[PDB]
């Protein structure tokens, strides 16, 4: 099984640099070109450059020369990318991908991506608020519950219900930024026969502040 594992989310200050990694496994690391791609919202996908791990030969897009630096360590089958002189324009999700040959000629396997945020705003953990219906008369055969996630920085936050066992009828909305603080929410609709009879809990993870918050949804009044 071919696998490309990328490092975690990064919050860097303008002007600084960041170095992320892509650990390869499941194939001969040194025989294939490794590529790096930028995914900035509203820009689409952009090719940054590539390195042949066997001898570290690199080729870069003109736009990224002097911005990106690609390296590789064969002993640990890990490829790296360093972005320097960061500006807000560098805030994006960065992917590594293997260029195959033989059975296919293209980028067949991709890492899960590394989110980078360039800003001077301070890291803040998420305030998680349980959302229960205001009245019992506002509960029929189906009941919608939710969790409001406010005042956190930087993105991303990940949300699950009942540790992932509750996945049907869930809507997790994209985060919105307001004065250096993000806000997002998630709704879940379940049978009234299951709640409040059975417990419903939203789980919020914020790796950027190494925090996890679990909030049980309980009836008001």
């Amino acid at each position: 099984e071919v696998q490309l594992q990328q490092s975690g989310t990064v919050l860097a200050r303008p002007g600084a640099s960041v170095k992320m990694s892509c650990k390869a496994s499941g194939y001969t690391f040194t025989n294939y070109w490794m590529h790096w791609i930028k995914q900035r919202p509203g820009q689409g996908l952009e090719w940054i450059g590539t390195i042949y791990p066997g001898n570290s030969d690199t080729t870069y897009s003109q736009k990224f020369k002097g911005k990106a630096k690609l390296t590789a360590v064969t002993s640990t089958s890990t490829a790296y990318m360093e972005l320097s002189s960061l500006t807000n324009e560098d805030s994006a999700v960065y992917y590594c991908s293997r260029r195959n040959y033989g059975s296919s000629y293209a980028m067949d396997y991709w890492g899960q991506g590394t989110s980078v945020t360039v800003s001077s705003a301070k890291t803040t953990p998420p305030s998680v608020y349980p959302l229960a219906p205001g009245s019992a008369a506002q509960t029929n055969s189906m009941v919608t519950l939710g969790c409001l996630v406010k005042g956190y920085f930087p993105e991303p936050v990940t949300v699950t219900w009942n540790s992932g066992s509750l996945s049907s009828g869930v809507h997790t909305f994209p985060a919105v930024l307001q004065s250096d603080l993000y806000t997002l929410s998630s709704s879940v609709t379940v049978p009234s026969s299951t709640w409040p009879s059975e417990t419903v809990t939203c789980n919020v993870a914020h790796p950027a502040s190494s925090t996890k918050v679990d909030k049980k949804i309980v009836p008001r009044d």
């Binding site: 608020y129 229960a132 009245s135 939710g146 406010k150 929410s185």
Partner: protein, 217 residues
């Protein structure tokens, strides 16, 4: 010049229809060995981009026979016969030979029948109240089309300030949209009024869908 231009930017299509996406290069791109390294990648929200087609017309493993690639010289086309609900996302063409370059992408969206939103409104939790804040939340789920506006009422009075809205990506199964609207006030403000109302104006009605509660329940 060698820039890759995709047409169109957005491709609204009905289920069962045939979808066609163009990608033209500003220069012939056939490699010296006679092969053309032109690929198509697809990226769905929350996922990594993934390979669909390589060397112009070769389908990658796990890709539906419905996706077909063709073209020559400077004109390439990705055709999706019998579009299905889960085909939505952003399709990108990409030149893999010298100075690998991505086209600007084409967002495939599904057109379907109209649907009214299921509305739910929620008072501020006691935890947030303790911190001195008060957000009233409203979810408008599973509706179509995407165009919709929310109206917040406090004791019958319209309120526009302090509202934060977010919309989900189109649903890959029912092709509808969902949105969340959060009206944030201070605890003191929230405590001076009683009636909170969330109202949706969608072309599925001449009379909006109203949902509310009283700080008395």
């Amino acid at each position: 010049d060698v820039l890759m231009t995709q047409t169109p930017l957005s491709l609204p299509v009905s289920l069962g229809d045939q979808a066609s996406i163009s990608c033209r290069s500003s220069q012939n791109i056939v490699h010296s060995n006679g092969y053309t390294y032109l690929e198509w990648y697809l990226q769905k929200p929350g996922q990594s981009p993934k390979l669909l087609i390589y060397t112009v017309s070769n389908r990658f493993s796990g890709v539906p026979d419905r996706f077909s690639g063709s073209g020559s010289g400077t004109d390439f086309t990705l055709k999706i016969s019998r579009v299905e609900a889960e085909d939505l996302g952003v399709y990108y063409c990409f030149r893999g030979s010298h100075v690998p370059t991505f086209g600007g992408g084409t967002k495939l969206e599904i057109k379907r029948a109209d649907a009214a939103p299921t509305v739910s409104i929620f008072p501020p939790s006691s935890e947030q109240l303790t911190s001195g804040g008060a957000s009233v939340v409203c979810f408008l789920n599973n509706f179509y089309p995407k165009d919709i506006n929310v109206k917040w009422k406090i004791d019958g009075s319209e309120r526009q300030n302090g509202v934060l809205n977010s919309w989900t990506d189109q649903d890959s199964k029912d092709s509808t949209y969902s949105m969340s609207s959060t009206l944030t006030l201070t605890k003191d403000e929230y405590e001076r009024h009683n009636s909170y109302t969330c109202e949706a104006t969608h072309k599925t009605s001449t009379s909006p869908i109203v949902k509310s509660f009283n700080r008395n329940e």
